[PDB]
Amino acid sequence: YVSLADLERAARDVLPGEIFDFLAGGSGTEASLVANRTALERVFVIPRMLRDLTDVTTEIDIFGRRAALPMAVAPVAYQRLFHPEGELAVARAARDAGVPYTICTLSSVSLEEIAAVGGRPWFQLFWLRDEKRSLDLVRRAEDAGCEAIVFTVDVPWMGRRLRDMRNGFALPEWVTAANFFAPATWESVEAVRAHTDLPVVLKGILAVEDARRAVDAGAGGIVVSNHGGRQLDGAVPGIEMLGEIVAAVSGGCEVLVDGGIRSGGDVLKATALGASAVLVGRPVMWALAAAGQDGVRQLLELLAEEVRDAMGLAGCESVGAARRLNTKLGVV
Amino acid sequence: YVSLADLERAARDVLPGEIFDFLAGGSGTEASLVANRTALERVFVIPRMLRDLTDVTTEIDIFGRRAALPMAVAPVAYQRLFHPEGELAVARAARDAGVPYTICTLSSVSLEEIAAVGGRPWFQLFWLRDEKRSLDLVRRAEDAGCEAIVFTVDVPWMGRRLRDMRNGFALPEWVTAANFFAPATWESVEAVRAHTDLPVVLKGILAVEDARRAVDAGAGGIVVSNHGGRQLDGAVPGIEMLGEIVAAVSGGCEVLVDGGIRSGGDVLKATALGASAVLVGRPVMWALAAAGQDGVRQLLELLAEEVRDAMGLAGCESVGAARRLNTKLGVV
Amino acid sequence: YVSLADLERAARDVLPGEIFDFLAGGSGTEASLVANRTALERVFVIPRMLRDLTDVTTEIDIFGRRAALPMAVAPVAYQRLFHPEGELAVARAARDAGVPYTICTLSSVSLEEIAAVGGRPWFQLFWLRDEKRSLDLVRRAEDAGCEAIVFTVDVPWMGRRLRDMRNGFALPEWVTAANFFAPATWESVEAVRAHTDLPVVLKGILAVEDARRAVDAGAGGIVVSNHGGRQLDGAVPGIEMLGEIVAAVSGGCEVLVDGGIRSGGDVLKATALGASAVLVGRPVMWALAAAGQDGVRQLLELLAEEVRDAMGLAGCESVGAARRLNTKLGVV
Amino acid sequence: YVSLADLERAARDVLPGEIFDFLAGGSGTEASLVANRTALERVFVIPRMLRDLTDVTTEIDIFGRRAALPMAVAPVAYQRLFHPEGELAVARAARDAGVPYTICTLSSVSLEEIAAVGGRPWFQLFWLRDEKRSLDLVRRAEDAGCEAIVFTVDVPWMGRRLRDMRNGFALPEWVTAANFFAPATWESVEAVRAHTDLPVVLKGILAVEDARRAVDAGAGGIVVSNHGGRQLDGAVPGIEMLGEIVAAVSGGCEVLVDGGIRSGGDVLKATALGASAVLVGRPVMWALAAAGQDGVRQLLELLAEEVRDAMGLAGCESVGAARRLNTKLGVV
Numbered sequence A, B, C, D: 001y002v003s004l005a006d007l008e009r010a011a012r013d014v015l016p017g018e019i020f021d022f023l024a025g026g027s028g029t030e031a032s033l034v035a036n037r038t039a040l041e042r043v044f045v046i047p048r049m050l051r052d053l054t055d056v057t058t059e060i061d062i063f064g065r066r067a068a069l070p071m072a073v074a075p076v077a078y079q080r081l082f083h084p085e086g087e088l089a090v091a092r093a094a095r096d097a098g099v100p101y102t103i104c105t106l107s108s109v110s111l112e113e114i115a116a117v118g119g120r121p122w123f124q125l126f127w128l129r130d131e132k133r134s135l136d137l138v139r140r141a142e143d144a145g146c147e148a149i150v151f152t153v154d155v156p157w158m159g160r161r162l163r164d165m166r167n168g169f170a171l172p173e174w175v176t177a178a179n180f181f182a183p184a185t186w187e188s189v190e191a192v193r194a195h196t197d198l199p200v201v202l203k204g205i206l207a208v209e210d211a212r213r214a215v216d217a218g219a220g221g222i223v224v225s226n227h228g229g230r231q232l233d234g235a236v237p238g239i240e241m242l243g244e245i246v247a248a249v250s251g252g253c254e255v256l257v258d259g260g261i262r263s264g265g266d267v268l269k270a271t272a273l274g275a276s277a278v279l280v281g282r283p284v285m286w287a288l289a290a291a292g293q294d295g296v297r298q299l300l301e302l303l304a305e306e307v308r309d310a311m312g313l314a315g316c317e318s319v320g321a322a323r324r325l326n327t328k329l330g331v332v
């Protein structure tokens, strides 16, 4: 594999069509799914030359701990759909690569088992029927050693996935929600913040004032995201709001972005627009489907090479330097 | 049916080619027909998160009465072209869905029969040979219980529909103007306003100063519209003038928009740009052609689901909240 | 024929490939040829409603005389290439339609014969080897009753027409320059202006300061034009400079435009951007090739219908009103 | 050959696929390779008319010597890959055309042999393992009569060429680096500047502040360049930074540009945006592959004709006049 696109082709060959569609699809007409890619393709980096690259490092510190790259594995539900080892294979490869792994509320292996793999597990929360149940899930994650609560804030309910409807897609009987919903509000965020010492990261912020309010609410970070184009069809890509959001928060929390990251060059674009780090979703599942744990390992080593390559070619010895790069919008 | 596009495919299968062309076509090169879709596809919504959605409602008040959605059925002439029950089937489904139905001057069933269906009938007016005849038609509509006069202001004459010319399209002998023209002016608007207590709504406004003059003329509303790309080929899409027009009228009348609305997400875009409500034309006729009254019912229930879905995903418990959403233009 | 595109298809059927290529082609990569069309397709008109259309007229006064439309036939060389009657057929149809006809310096019938047809002949000048010969040609045109000198200013030499090179295209022996070159300068313009009482119109102006200098030089008009994309490959379309040029000349001369006018809607766009009138080139030759004089007659009657249709739909009872229309750029 | 594209077609026919791919390819997804062309295609020139063209000249003075065109042959490694005579054939044709030729550090014929051809040889430098070796290479070039040191500053290491990886491309045993690396810094630039009296030209500058720093560092010129899209995938095209860079340097050094120059019209665009001269890479190799020295001669004579044609059509008797042309961005 020399690009992430090699992995998509491999995953399409192996997966049943309806499972590939569950993974690949978005809501509605898939306008936001496509726009995530269009937006990145419009961004061009203005690289710097002739800087000291004797000690190029892709490492960052985030939520109190080092990560080997400015990247984490995005929460993706039901990973046993893609490979029999599911979440354990992905978490093992992420741990070995020094990349945080986001455990899902809807994981097909229990959060305690995934956390036992080690590494830097984060936990993604969906708000449950009642506050007590929701906070018990947060407590389980904390007790198991998860290092951040990634509270998904863009799913009052799941969006309308037309591929799944047309396929009549249902979970196989051999895939379950191994950890076992009502719309979250700012009051829910406060309940979580008051119930944990872990950083709370709000995933799915797109409006500038919601980013500001996230800081005021005590969030340790946000993920600027349209949920991979799976929620509101027509929601702006996170990458298009990122610069405005970074300016408005003015360092008050970590600002991550996701949606359509498909190369180290895309990571560089995200950092040049101001992101602290990115999440990567579908490509990790392509690698899992294609070759299990070893596939994910190969994907992460390819991304690490691409990130180092892009940073050095752009004159950046550190991720902080990459955040100071300028960009110019073009046409594609 | 999981999208409005399912209905177009069904209607193309059943309708004779020349009738499908009468419905689908625009004037000239169809530049304005295509631009109605292009314009909507360029708009992206910036959704809000974490708001109270316990009582999400898609209802609005317009022209003194509640509507179940921020939408009405646009005036489309000669509905018996598409199904034997024609206007009665559409009006029955609209009534049952709580959506206003616009009766045409060129309806293939008399306006009194359509009004007798019940619901919230509006009446669309074309200006006739002389003021007296025009005002008699307005009086008939009022006597029959129509709740608004939708005065079409963009048809001094009908545009040049090249599909119809190439097809030699003519009305079948079994379709007639069951209610049975000169260019309307501002004097005609005043004659109507002085002759009825019903709200007068000017359909086909695109220039900002025409919207302002509409308010000054006593209009209760306007429809910002290029007539579905059927009138001036090269006329700007209504959606592209909507924001400027909403600012200029500053609440002095209701501001509706039409042209290319094909999903609840498109309704959300229109409201985020400032519209009070939208009209929907061709998709209603697709549903009528595909399955008569039940087809229209299914279309309206699908649109209701899509509107509720889009509003909630965007953090809007009411249409008023949706009007306060921000947007960002993208590339497609 | 219901559109000008019908005529292109007819002309392609009848003409030898190398002659069609001589007519259709541009210089270099044909970037400016294509851009003439792209530019018009990006312009949208903001029509006005409810205005008095009792006496809609497409007539204008230009260079002292009435024209039936805001249009003239552009100078196109060697019209016998397209039909045996060549320039006489086109001039007869133009006369009958009330449209000025531009006689070429490189006409395949003598300018005196074409002028004898009557109508409103203009004469297009290429600067010749020496001032004396050039001025004799101007004097011939004036003596024959031509009403304006259209001095082509964008041909210091002919551009590089790759279709013609690849075809090895040469004039047939039966086509000659029946009136029988050095680069023109501002001194040449002054020599012409001092030698005739006819209005001098500079064809091929694109730079704002060249338009201003044209007024200062005593020109009665300019044609904002990239020569149909046949001269500098990469020259901006005239339609894209028109608004800036109209503002800079501030009524000091007539401002015409050409390049890619293919419908009455395109004429409306040009006038809304500020043009006094347009020239039309290739479509007139398509009509000539397809059906001789009667073909040109049909083209001009179609254009007249389209211009009247577009003006009325846009609320314009006169061309002056159309010049006051606003426009909005879109995407295509 | 009537366009540079004729030469690409000829080269694709003759070269082995993997060698054509080495020449044609870029890094990553080839976004920057494509953008070099997209950017030029968006630029339109505003030509001037009626200027004195009695003595049109395409000559410039650069680095102390006359050149026949505002163009030089870009450094392209291993020219024996494309033709048995390799660099000698290209240098001979460049000399005969009056165009400077850039000798590569990775040339397949020694720099002394290429310099012995005569003409105006420049020397492109890659920074070597240590300062002493690097400066010895500079000294060799100076001793051999090279007239400028083109220090490549955008290659801390070579980019990731996916075509080469997928082809498993390797140099044939019959091609070697006949002159026989560590990342260059500003200290390396200073070491070169202090070690030679020749002008030092920094190739691969894209950031405005790097252009300013180049002037402050004593560079005699810069090449605004993304290395033909072969280095950072996603780097902005040089043509898009050129105007801003020309303004910032305010005549303090020569400002060249490269990337996607494919015609004399493209040369005109580059000069109108402010470039002193362009480099041309791939097309020179197409000509070499197609027909050796005579092929390169034909390419350079075609480019000379196209440059003269474009300049005159735009009203420019000199390259300085072309730099004063204005431009307008369009859509393609």
Ligand SMILES: Cc1cc2cc3c(=O)[nH]c(=O)nc-3n(C[C@H](O)[C@H](O)[C@H](O)COP(=O)(O)O)c2cc1C
Pocket: A022, A023, A024, A036, A074, A075, A076, A077, A104, A105, A106, A124, A152, A203, A225, A226, A227, A228, A230, A258, A259, A260, A261, A279, A280, A281, A282, A283
């Ligand atoms: C099959 C699938 C399931 C989930 C389940 C979740 C989830 O239970 N909670 C959550 O908070 N985000 C989810 N996501 C979104 C994900 O976390 C990233 O937001 C996007 O995948 C980023 O885009 P790509 O990198 O995929 O473009 C999913 C994405 C995909 C494709």
Ligand SMILES: Cc1cc2cc3c(=O)[nH]c(=O)nc-3n(C[C@H](O)[C@H](O)[C@H](O)COP(=O)(O)O)c2cc1C
Pocket: B022, B023, B024, B036, B074, B075, B076, B077, B104, B105, B106, B124, B152, B203, B225, B226, B227, B228, B230, B258, B259, B260, B261, B279, B280, B281, B282, B283
């Ligand atoms: C076949 C057909 C007949 C009519 C007859 C009328 C009419 O006698 N009076 C009027 O005032 N508007 C009409 N219209 C325009 C319509 O009311 C809406 O303006 C558009 O259809 C909105 O666009 P879509 O929702 O269709 O894109 C029509 C549209 C179509 C397609």
Ligand SMILES: Cc1cc2cc3c(=O)[nH]c(=O)nc-3n(C[C@H](O)[C@H](O)[C@H](O)COP(=O)(O)O)c2cc1C
Pocket: C022, C023, C024, C036, C074, C075, C076, C077, C104, C105, C106, C124, C152, C203, C225, C226, C227, C228, C230, C258, C259, C260, C261, C279, C280, C281, C282, C283
């Ligand atoms: C075959 C052909 C010959 C000529 C000869 C001349 C000419 O001896 N003098 C002149 O001054 N302009 C010419 N022109 C340009 C023409 O007058 C109009 O500028 C464009 O044709 C407008 O574009 P379309 O309406 O054609 O797009 C020509 C255009 C075409 C196609």
Ligand SMILES: Cc1cc2cc3c(=O)[nH]c(=O)nc-3n(C[C@H](O)[C@H](O)[C@H](O)COP(=O)(O)O)c2cc1C
Pocket: D022, D023, D024, D036, D074, D075, D076, D077, D104, D105, D106, D124, D152, D203, D225, D226, D227, D228, D230, D258, D259, D260, D261, D279, D280, D281, D282, D283
């Ligand atoms: C096969 C190939 C080898 C080299 C080797 C070098 C090099 O050892 N040093 C350097 O400094 N630039 C190089 N280049 C870039 C070149 O000098 C021009 O920057 C681009 O080719 C301009 O774009 P095109 O005119 O090619 O679009 C190369 C370009 C190509 C295609």
Ligand SMILES: [Mg+2]
Pocket: A257, A258, A259, A260, A261, A262, A278, A279, A280, A281
């Ligand atoms: Mg991503």
Ligand SMILES: [Mg+2]
Pocket: B257, B258, B259, B260, B261, B262, B278, B279, B280, B281
């Ligand atoms: Mg609509």
Ligand SMILES: [Mg+2]
Pocket: C257, C258, C259, C260, C261, C262, C278, C279, C280, C281
């Ligand atoms: Mg024209």
Ligand SMILES: [Mg+2]
Pocket: D257, D258, D259, D260, D261, D262, D278, D279, D280, D281
């Ligand atoms: Mg180049």
